Design a protein around this ligand. Structure first.
Ligand SMILES: Cc1cc2nc3c(=O)[nH]c(=O)nc-3n(C[C@H](O)[C@H](O)[C@H](O)COP(=O)(O)OP(=O)(O)OC[C@H]3O[C@@H](n4cnc5c(N)ncnc54)[C@H](O)[C@@H]3O)c2cc1C
Ligand SMILES: NC(=O)c1ccc[n+]([C@@H]2O[C@H](COP(=O)([O-])OP(=O)(O)OC[C@H]3O[C@H](n4cnc5c(N)ncnc54)[C@H](OP(=O)(O)O)[C@@H]3O)[C@@H](O)[C@H]2O)c1
Length: 296
């Protein structure tokens, strides 16, 4: 052990308490993505970067059976947002879809519950879960973050642990010296979750953190379509591949499914110029624990 896993399971979950539920999507954006913080005092839920936790929503489904957990990537570092080892945070988007056929807009159960949760409320938290999105202990490692929407959550945990002054002071063991690159694909600028903090990290650390955005409603790719994270990985395909070649580099992909086939096609052309088949180099990176994916 070292990596915490399942200190709380579904049968007897941690009764956490909401401290804050703040909006991430600013005025003019598409959606509601909230940053919810939960009090962890009273128990022993310790968690690490890249992990997730479950939230069991209240109520029953359409069949009468209780609602089962929904996994959410932790948006905070092990220390929490206030760097006190007392809280855990999440970056939750309210699932919403206008009809598979009929009855109009539908709202996701756990996501709506969470995006509208009030401070002081008790929540059923399980977790931590996941050994697939962990950050290397090596401060000199390079890390490529490929995020879309709520997949910004685990990237935030790496970036804050690496770049927040208080996190640095709390971690003498991890004083990040490498290069991290976030390619974040959101539909509008107000939809850039944690824009202020992401940008102020890139300002303090120009040579250590590069920030690339693919904003769908304000940018077009070289083919005239809307700008997606794949288009962005495509225009920087060579550089991205030149970094992937390093033994210390780690790549993280997170967000809803669908972005993986474009990131691959792009990194394939890059890699093919030097004689290597990306998919086979990738297979080896996964076995090596250096190519991390979590799409949902
Ligand atoms: C490891 C992991 C990490 C995750 N991290 C996050 C995170 O950080 N943030 C986050 O917001 N979510 C995250 N999720 C997703 C989250 O677990 C829930 O799946 C999501 O919040 C929706 O659950 P819900 O309770 O709102 O909806 P439910 O009520 O369970 O929704 C039920 C159904 O809605 C559906 N559906 C979704 N979109 C459509 C559509 N467009 N058209 C038709 N049907 C549709 C599917 O049929 C699904 O079965 C993560 C999932 C996993 C596995
Ligand atoms: N209206 C409400 O009050 C309410 C509440 C909650 C949520 N909504 C949900 O909130 C969400 C926004 O959250 P966010 O800030 O986390 O951003 P986001 O939606 O995660 O960003 C991801 C991207 O997926 C799209 N994507 C589309 N086509 C694609 C393709 N070919 N390849 C790859 N990706 C594609 C979207 O583009 P385009 O859409 O531009 O094509 C979008 O920019 C919305 O999707 C919304 O439906 C509504």
């Amino acid at each position: 052990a070292d990596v915490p896993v399942n200190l709380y399971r579904p049968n007897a979950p941690f009764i956490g308490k909401v401290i804050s539920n703040e909006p991430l999507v600013k005025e003019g954006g598409i959606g509601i993505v909230q940053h919810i913080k939960f009090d962890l005092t009273g128990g022993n839920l310790k968690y690490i970067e890249g992990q997730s936790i479950g939230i069991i929503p209240p109520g029953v489904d359409k069949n009468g059976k209780p609602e089962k957990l929904r996994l959410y990537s932790i948006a905070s570092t092990r220390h929490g947002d206030d760097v006190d080892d007392k809280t855990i945070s999440l970056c939750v988007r309210q699932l919403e879809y206008k009809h598979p056929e009929s009855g109009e807009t539908v709202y996701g159960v756990c996501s709506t519950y969470l995006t509208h949760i009030e401070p002081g409320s008790e929540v059923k938290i399980t977790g931590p879960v996941g050994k697939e999105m962990l950050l290397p202990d090596d401060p000199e490692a390079n890390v490529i973050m490929l995020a879309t929407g709520t997949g910004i959550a685990p990237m935030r945990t790496y970036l804050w642990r690496m770049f927040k002054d208080a996190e640095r002071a709390a971690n003498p063991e991890y004083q990040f010296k490498g290069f991290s690159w976030l390619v974040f694909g959101v539909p509008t600028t107000p939809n850039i979750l944690y824009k202020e903090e992401l940008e102020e990290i890139q300002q303090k650390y120009p040579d250590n953190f590069r920030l690339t955005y693919a904003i769908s409603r304000e940018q077009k790719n070289p083919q005239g379509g809307r700008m997606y994270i794949q288009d962005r990985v495509a225009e920087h395909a060579d550089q991205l591949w030149q970094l992937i070649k390093n033994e210390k580099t780690h790549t993280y992909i997170c967000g809803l499914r669908g972005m993986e086939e474009g990131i691959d096609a792009a990194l394939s052309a890059a890699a093919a110029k030097e004689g290597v088949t990306w998919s086979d180099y990738q297979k080896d990176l996964k076995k090596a624990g250096r190519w991390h994916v979590e799409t949902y």
